[PDB]
Amino acid sequence: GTLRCTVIADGVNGSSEKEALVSFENSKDGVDVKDTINYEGLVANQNYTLTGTLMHVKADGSLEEIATKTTNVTAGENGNGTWGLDFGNQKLQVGEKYVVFENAESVENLIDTDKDYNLDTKQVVKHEDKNDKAQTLVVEKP
Ligand SMILES: [Ca+2]
Ligand SMILES: [Mg+2]
């Protein structure tokens, strides 16, 4: 299983090549942060708990949690498709960088870990990459 994720910050797409740059003017009423999640290799029609976390990337490189959202979502045909996670309006700081992490965990046991053909473990897929610019936004200075 894989999650391939792109952030939208006040309407600005992140990409692997360029963080989502939020204009100073757009930062004044906060920053609307939405994540888009393309998943593959999940179990078709199974329910997952998707947890997204918005992390402040501090000048020293460490991370601080700003917001966390959970949503009940369902894997589509052949266990691939698209989900969304809306952080809503976040009061982010001018000049600062933020990154979105995602974690998908099946509601049901979908994996046999003890060779008894009884499914006993949830499927877990994570994208927790502070160096992924597609999941990163920066609030521009004036
Ligand atoms: Ca705004
Ligand atoms: Mg088992």
Author numbering: 446 to 587
Sentences from the paper on this structure:
Central to this ability are non‐canonical covalent intramolecular crosslinks between protein side chains forming isopeptide, thioester, and ester bonds that impart remarkable stability enhancement to single adhesin protein domains or are involved directly in covalent adhesion to host cells (Alegre‐Cebollada et al. 2010; Kang et al. 2007; Kang and Baker 2009; Kwon et al. 2014; Lei et al. 2021; Miller et al. 2018; Pointon et al. 2010; Walden et al. 2015). The autocalytic machinery of ester bond crosslinking, as first exemplified in the Clostridium perfringens adhesin Cpe0147, shows three residues (D577/H572/T450) arranged in space to mimic the acid/base/nucleophile catalytic triad of a serine protease, with Q580 the equivalent of a substrate electrophile (Kwon et al. 2014; Schwarz‐Linek and Banfield 2014). Two buried and protonated acids, D480 and E547, act like the oxyanion site of a serine protease, polarizing the carbonyl bond of Q580 side chain to increase its electrophilic potential and reactivity, and potentially stabilizing a high‐energy tetrahedral intermediate. In the proposed mechanism, H572 abstracts a proton from T450 Oγ1, which then effects nucleophilic attack on the Q580 Cδ with the loss of the side chain amino group as ammonia—the final state is the equivalent of the acyl‐intermediate of a serine protease mechanism, but without the potential to hydrolyze it is essentially trapped.
The T450C protein is found predominantly as non‐crosslinked and disulfide crosslinked species under non‐reducing SDS‐PAGE —this scenario is detailed below in the SEC‐MALLS and X‐ray crystallography results. Only a very small proportion of T450C protein forms the smallest hydrodynamic radius, crosslinked species eluting similarly to the wild‐type protein at ~12.5 mL and with a thioester crosslink confirmed by mass spectrometry. A close inspection of the mutation site shows no thioester crosslink with the C450 thiol group sequestered in the pocket otherwise occupied by the methyl group of the wild‐type T450. The reactive sidechain of Q580 forms hydrogen bonds through both Oε1 and Nε2 atoms with the protonated buried acid, D480. The position of E547 is unchanged compared to the wild type, pointing away from the ester bond position and making a hydrogen bond with D480. A wild‐type, non‐crosslinked model was produced from the T450C structure. Geometric analysis following the method of Du et al. formulated for serine protease characterization gives an attack distance, d attack, of 2.65 Å measured between nucleophile Oγ and electrophile target atom Cδ (Du et al. 2025). The attack angles α attack and φ attack are calculated at 104° and 89°, respectively. In this model, the close approach (2.65 Å) of nucleophile threonine Oγ and electrophile glutamine Cδ, and the perpendicular relative orientation of the side chains, are consistent with the geometric arrangement observed by Du et al. within 1000+ serine proteases (Du et al. 2025).
